[PDB]
């Protein structure tokens, strides 16, 4: 709640901006517009491009790499908006940069931002 305090991950609610895998999310959580933690909502198009963060999982003490993915082709969902920036680097380090609309690769050249999923792709601190 204090926007400036160190972020504190939890592993008990994915709709919340402090959910551990959203440590470098920018946009909206897909679970809140009919995706799930790792699937896009009906009628949107799943980007193949990704951004990564290393996120601490307070359930098991391990940090995991979250390759975020955008669900594209719809106006922005407006539900569960969140912006975190753990490890987020400026645009010239685009692999860790999250202001970019990462809709590349989405079916039907969809490029509008609807929401982001947070699947794990491996471990590493």
């Amino acid at each position: 709640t204090d926007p400036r305090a160190k972020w504190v991950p939890q592993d008990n609610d994915i709709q919340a901006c402090d959910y551990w895998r959203h440590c470098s999310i920018d946009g909206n959580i897909c679970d809140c517009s009919g995706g799930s933690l790792t699937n896009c909502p009906p009628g949107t198009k799943l980007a193949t491009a990704s951004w990564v963060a290393s996120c601490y999982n307070p359930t098991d003490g391990q940090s995991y790499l979250i390759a975020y993915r955008d669900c594209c082709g719809y106006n922005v969902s407006g539900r569960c908006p969140c912006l975190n920036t753990e490890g987020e680097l400026p645009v010239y380090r685009p692999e860790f940069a999250n202001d970019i609309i990462w809709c590349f690769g989405a079916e039907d050249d969809a490029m509008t931002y609807h929401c982001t999923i947070s699947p794990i792709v491996g471990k590493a601190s």
């Binding site: 592993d11 008990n12 609610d13 994915i14 709709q15 919340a16 959910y19 679970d31 009919g34 995706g35 799930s36 933690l37 790792t38 699937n39 896009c40 909502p41 009906p42 009628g43 949107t44 198009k45 799943l46 359930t59 993915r69 669900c71 999923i117 699947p119 794990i120």
Partner: peptide, 23 residues
């Protein structure tokens, strides 16, 4: 959003893979 973090933790714990996709 709670039920869902639990199901996701369990999937992670079990090593259950699932394809990101359009629901």
């Amino acid at each position: 959003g709670q039920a869902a973090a639990r199901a996701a933790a369990a999937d992670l714990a079990a090593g259950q893979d699932d394809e990101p996709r359009i629901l």
